Amino acid sequence: IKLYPLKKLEIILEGAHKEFATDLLDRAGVKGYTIVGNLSGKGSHMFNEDDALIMIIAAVPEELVGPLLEGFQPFFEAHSGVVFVHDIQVGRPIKFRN
Amino acid sequence: IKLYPLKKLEIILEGAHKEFATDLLDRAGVKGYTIVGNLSGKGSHGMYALIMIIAAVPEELVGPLLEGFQPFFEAHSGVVFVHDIQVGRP
Amino acid sequence: AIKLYPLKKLEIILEGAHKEFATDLLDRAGVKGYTIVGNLSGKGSHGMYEGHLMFNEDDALIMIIAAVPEELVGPLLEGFQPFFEAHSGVVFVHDIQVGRPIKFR
Ligand SMILES: Nc1ncnc2c1ncn2[C@@H]1O[C@H](COP(=O)(O)OP(=O)(O)O)[C@@H](O)[C@H]1O
Numbered sequence: 200i201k202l203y204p205l206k207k208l209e210i211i212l213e214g215a216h217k218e219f220a221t222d223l224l225d226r227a228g229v230k231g232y233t234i235v236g237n238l239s240g241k242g243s244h245m246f247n248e249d250d251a252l253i254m255i256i257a258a259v260p261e262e263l264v265g266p267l268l269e270g271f272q273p274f275f276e277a278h279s280g281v282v283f284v285h286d287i288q289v290g291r292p293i294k295f296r297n
Numbered sequence: 298i299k300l301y302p303l304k305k306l307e308i309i310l311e312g313a314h315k316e317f318a319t320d321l322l323d324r325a326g327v328k329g330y331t332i333v334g335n336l337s338g339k340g341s342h343g344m345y346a347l348i349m350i351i352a353a354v355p356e357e358l359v360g361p362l363l364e365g366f367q368p369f370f371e372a373h374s375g376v377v378f379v380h381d382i383q384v385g386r387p
Numbered sequence: 388a389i390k391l392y393p394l395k396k397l398e399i400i401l402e403g404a405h406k407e408f409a410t411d412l413l414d415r416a417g418v419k420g421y422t423i424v425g426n427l428s429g430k431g432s433h434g435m436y437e438g439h440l441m442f443n444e445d446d447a448l449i450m451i452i453a454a455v456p457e458e459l460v461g462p463l464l465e466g467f468q469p470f471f472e473a474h475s476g477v478v479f480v481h482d483i484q485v486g487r488p489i490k491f492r
Pocket residue numbers: 229230231232233234256257258259295400428429430431432433434435436448474475476477
């Protein structure tokens with residue numbers, strides 16, 4: 200019944216860069232992630248209407264957000280996409296923090 | 298990298314109304330959006346054709362956007378969820 | 388002009404074969420609606436789930452998005468607990484705002 204805080208990233212980028220983003224999550228110690236495929240978009244939160252986009256959802260301890268955004272920075276300065284950081288609550292924070 | 302507050306809308310509606318919804322985001326000054334397609338769902342009318350439009354906007358654009366979506370959602374199925382999020386800028 | 392009200396939003400990620408178990412818990416608790424994102428992929432503690440590799444589309448990971456009043460969170464999580472102790476998946480609880488509490492409560 201008790202809930203514990205965590206952060207949740209939504210990383211939206213072109214499907215061709217999936218391996219780069221998942222490798223970056225794995226190296227930072229992220230314990231898991233979910234990928235929503237076949238997304239489409241327009242502009243900037245630029246995306247072309249024909250781009251095959253994905254959204255990577257990653258629940259992470261707050262201590263990993265800074266290093267992850269620092270890792271995604273050179274990528275997002277040269278490629279389309281974004282990272283949305285959410286506050287979430289989970290019942291079992293051990294599943295998400297090493 | 299500094300974190301900045303934003304609002305993130307999740308607008309869930311029938312795919313047949315996509316153009317109406319994206320035109321309204323365009324006309325309000327929303328700079329970009331992402332669409333999650335081919336959704337299923339349960340609502341007050343029955344089961345499901347549905348899409349989810351994700352837009353991260355400054356808080357000042359929330360009110361005008363909801364005011365724009367109001368006649369639509371008073372006559373059509375669909376929901377809007379407003380989230381508080383943070384985004385990092387260099 | 389449009390008043391906003393607080394609500395909670397669950398994201399429930401689980402194997403598609405368990406969709407009915409999850410939607411039945413939501414229906415029973417009085418959840419008024421839900422949205423399902425299908426054919427997902429993901430990395431779990433014991434391996435990868437790749438939706439596009441499944442022979443039956445219904446077996447792929449799904450994410451059930453459910454906006455619920457805060458009072459339904461505890462009973463729902465209590466229901467999901469034995470399931471997630473024996474099956475793959477996660478539940479993320481978010482704070483959101485909505486314009487029409489009656490549509491959800
Ligand atoms: N940290 C996380 N962030 C986002 N999604 C996650 C996370 N951890 C798990 N998931 C999702 O839950 C699914 C199942 O994870 P898990 O329960 O650890 O599975 P298993 O142990 O059987 O491999 C993952 O494939 C992923 O879709």
